[PDB]
Paper text:
We introduced an 8-oxoG at the center (-C16-p-8-oxoG17-) of a 35-bp GC-rich DNA duplex and mixed the purified protein and this DNA fragment at a molar ratio of 1.5:1 to assemble the OGG1–DNA complex. We obtained a cryo-EM 3D map of the complex at 3.6 Å average resolution. The EM map had densities for atomic modeling for aa 12–325 of the 345-residue human protein and 33 bp of the 35-bp DNA. Our cryo-EM structure shows that OGG1 binds tightly to the DNA minor groove and interacts with the sugar-phosphate backbone of the 8-oxoG-containing strand. The 8-oxoG base is fully flipped from the DNA helix and inserted deeply into the enzyme active pocket. This model of interaction and 8-oxoG flipping are similar to the previously reported crystal structures. In our structure, the top DNA strand G42, and OGG1 residues Cys-253, Gln-315 and Phe-319 interact with 8-oxoG, and OGG1 residues Asn-149, Lys-154, Tyr-203, and Lys-204 interact with the “estranged” base cytosine in the complementary bottom DNA. Because our DNA substrate has a cytosine before 8-oxoG (the CpG dinucleotide), Asn-151 and C (+17) form a base-specific contact, equivalent to the Asn-151 and Adenosine interaction in the previous crystal structure. The fact that OGG1 interacts well with both C-p-8-oxoG observed here and A-p-8-oxoG observed previously indicates that OGG1 can mold its catalytic pocket to interact with a different base immediately preceding the 8-oxoG. Our study has revealed that the human OGG1 binds and bends a linear and long DNA containing an oxidized CpG dinucleotide (C-p-8-oxoG) in a manner highly similar to the previously revealed binding on a short DNA and that the positively charged OGG1 C-terminus not only contributes to the DNA binding affinity but also induces DNA super-shifts, due to the binding at the dsDNA end(s) that do not contain a damage site.
Numbering used by the authors: 12 to 79, 83 to 325
The structure:
Amino acid sequence: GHRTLASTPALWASIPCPRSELRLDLVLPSGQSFRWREQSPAHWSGVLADQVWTLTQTEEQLHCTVYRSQASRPTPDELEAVRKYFQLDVTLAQLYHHWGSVDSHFQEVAQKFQGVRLLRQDPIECLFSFICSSNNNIARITGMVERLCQAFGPRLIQLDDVTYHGFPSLQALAGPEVEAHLRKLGLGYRARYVSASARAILEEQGGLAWLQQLRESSYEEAHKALCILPGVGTQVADCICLMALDKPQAVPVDVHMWHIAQRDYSWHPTTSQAKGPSPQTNKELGNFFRSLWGPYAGWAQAVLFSADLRQ
DNA sequence: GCCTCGCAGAATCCCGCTGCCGAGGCCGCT
DNA sequence: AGCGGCCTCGGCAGCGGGATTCTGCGAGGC
């Protein structure tokens, strides 16, 4: 079973994270990832780097525990791994103050919202998780990615309901027949969007090196490089850039963002000739959000997304 | 004696949207 | 002067499971 606060008191790891800077219940199930579930209150669990992670939040600290194989006191290198995963070197209070000074709508939204953060995931993990998250509700994608991880991932242990697996290796998905096999599992057409976006990594773009060299490249170059891949449009390209490549200038634009804009901000496509999902409208909204907010507008977008979901 | 209220069961919407199909702009050369 | 076709636009629609939202059916009792 998933570890509870009274399960194994010597199997935790505390890191400094105030509740004003971050809130677990508003970030992880808020579309940004699809490998974390809740069983007990204020608990989350998902596999990263072939290791099961369980996260909970106290008033001023974040508590962590791991499943691998029979050892406690997780090593500080994984603490730095989750620190990079959670942008703990970044401060959000000053960013909230900046946004409230420039625009009072974000302050009114954040009058009860304190700490909608963003993550920084592995690009293979985040990319393949967000392939099958297009035109799809969160719970379906969560079960969807869990079933894919069961089918193609190295399992760890059956933890009282369902086995947990490492996220599938890139050699496991770049083969043939995988589209039909995952369509049997129920990925929909996204299965094709996985297959065409697996071999293209290793057979036509240059392997894992081409993708891993994009974490220090320029914005538009990396954006177009991800957009060339099949199934990775501008929304998931910006999602990968923001949550796997450390590009805080990127604002994801989706159904929630556009409903929020058209109902709260009175923004309409000026240069564009329509009001429907389109790359020009996405670029216009990105430029507008960057100009009105600044260089870190994706984080304010994340707060807006968490506000949209819990309402 | 039929019509208000409940009530179970289909229909449709929806959800963190890309690939392909219409379309102007830019070149093309009669 | 005459219209063919490359290149980023705009509009859906493909894939499932859960909510709404309609959509017809029993009891009734004024």
